[PDB]
Design a protein around this ligand. Structure first.
Ligand code: ZN
Lengths: 52, 257, 252, 51
């Protein structure tokens, strides 16, 4: 889920550009919980390894 | 069969050669040594037959862990398996296991090569937008720069690697990291003022993660919190001066080049 | 508009990062600057909209027309991607110039890392620079400026083929230039010191060139654009007693 | 010819098959003996025409 996203984000340039424009929306469209989006947006990497 | 070591770069998924990725896809077995689990899953989906080498670690001496790591890889090669080793960054830069596996593989007469990949240095240049061919470039292993005589050229970018364990020895443990670092600062002070701005760099793994780029005076270095992958970048301290001598021979001046 | 400079590497097709390749696919326009035509054709099949910059007289004015052309696209608001040989931020002025001027016009500009000739050298020569340490200089710069190399660690000289590239005033052959370099290196390395002329393979059917020869035979050597000279150490290491003393280690 | 070098540079499978049986694989795509010769000889320059 979350892993499939990071994997896509790292290799697709289009998706990469979109993300840096509208991080939240893009993450929502890849079905991430509000908590995940938060952890990502606060850069709390410990809580992502919690939600995996 | 065969051995091929490949580098995944630093970034997840997207920072790997098209060919190296192909090798991992069309391989009978794949031995991995990657940082995070996001990277481990990525690899799995790319090839289900994966052996994680993180398991060979601890109490055991490193050269023992590596001995096992390497043997496990050759076991696959000897078995006739088209083996591929997936390493972080460049599979040759700071990678005793690759060289050992390749050397020993070649010894037994097995076909073994190493495909180049993107190292932390490759990233450092792009991230900071510095061109090493600009004023030159010197790379040393901190400890090696402290233990041995290495006079740096302060007209070039100077990279000190593994700054976290700078000066680490069995006979130096009585010193704290802050201490050893201080000693390194005293050494660099020979060429670089204490006010000189230095940069601590750490390449990102995840695409949602940023590279660490902490700018600070050389003097505040001892206090800085370092990481195993942390690297120090000391920009030039002097502008390049012409070799008026060599310019004389070619019969030109600074204004002609 | 936006700019993203990517690198193809040395090998064809296969030595580019997955992401950098994606940028080329999704680029509205691509500005190529690659050596061979096999690389040129490849790129095109990767994205039809490609403007070759070789089409663009001093190097001052050549790159000025190049950069200017790249910008035009970015100024028009087209997501521009500039594909260069090897690493787009290593011995590459066009990129740093373009990125700089795009940053200066408020446009978004960045650079993706690729595989440089150096990254290839380590693999082909099975050398780990992490443990050994290394140094890099542009051959010409190393000649026209005061660079003090450390002869205890590897020394790379890039663009050894065009070493001494300058405006004409006196008549000197490339061998004459290379002879001067040889003399200048003689301040640290002997003439009989073995060096290596490395040339990364472009095509997958070609093997890399790894010629060894004494430093004295460099002038005669037949060099190429992408040729780089590797000068292995010539001096032994010495204990840094000063610093060792501070750390706690002395006579031991 | 160009497509082959491209596939050979990207595809790790074709890469290996090539080393297994160079000549045969080059036929499988469709290159003449003159080309295969230039490839096998080592004359890069030679390939400046078959291109
Ligand atoms: Zn370097």
């Amino acid at each position: 889920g979350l892993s499939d996203f990071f994997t896509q984000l790292g290799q697709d340039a289009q998706l990469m550009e979109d993300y840096k424009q509208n991080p939240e929306a893009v993450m929502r469209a890849h079905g991430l919980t509000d908590e995940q989006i938060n952890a990502v947006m606060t850069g709390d990497m410990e809580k992502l390894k919690t939600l995996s | 069969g065969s051995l091929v070591c490949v580098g995944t770069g630093l970034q997840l998924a997207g920072q790997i050669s098209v060919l190296s990725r192909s090798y991992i896809e069309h391989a009978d077995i794949v031995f991995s040594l990657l940082p995070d689990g996001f990277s481990q899953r990525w690899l799995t989906k790319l090839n289900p037959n994966v052996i994680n080498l993180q398991q060979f670690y601890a109490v055991k001496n490193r050269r023992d862990t590596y001995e096992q790591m390497v043997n496990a890889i050759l076991d696959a090669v000897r078995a006739g398996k088209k083996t591929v080793c997936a390493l972080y960054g460049h599979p040759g830069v700071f990678a005793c296991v690759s060289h050992m596996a390749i050397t020993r593989a070649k010894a037994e007469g097995f076909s073994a090569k190493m495909e180049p990949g993107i190292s932390a240095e490759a990233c450092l240049w792009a991230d900071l937008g510095i061109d090493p061919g600009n004023s030159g470039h010197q790379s040393f292993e901190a400890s090696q720069f402290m233990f041995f005589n290495h006079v740096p050229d302060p007209t070039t970018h100077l990279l000190l690697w593994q700054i976290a364990i700078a000066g680490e020895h069995t006979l130096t443990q009585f010193h704290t990291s802050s201490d050893r670092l201080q000693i390194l600062v005293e050494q660099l002070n020979q060429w670089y003022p204490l006010d000189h701005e230095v940069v601590i760099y750490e390449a990102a793994n995840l695409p949602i993660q940023a590279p660490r780029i902490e700018r600070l005076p050389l003097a505040n270095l001892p206090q800085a919190h370092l990481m195993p992958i942390s690297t120090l970048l000391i920009p030039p301290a002097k502008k390049l001066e012409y070799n008026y001598a060599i310019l004389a021979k070619l019969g030109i001046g600074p204004e002609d080049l």
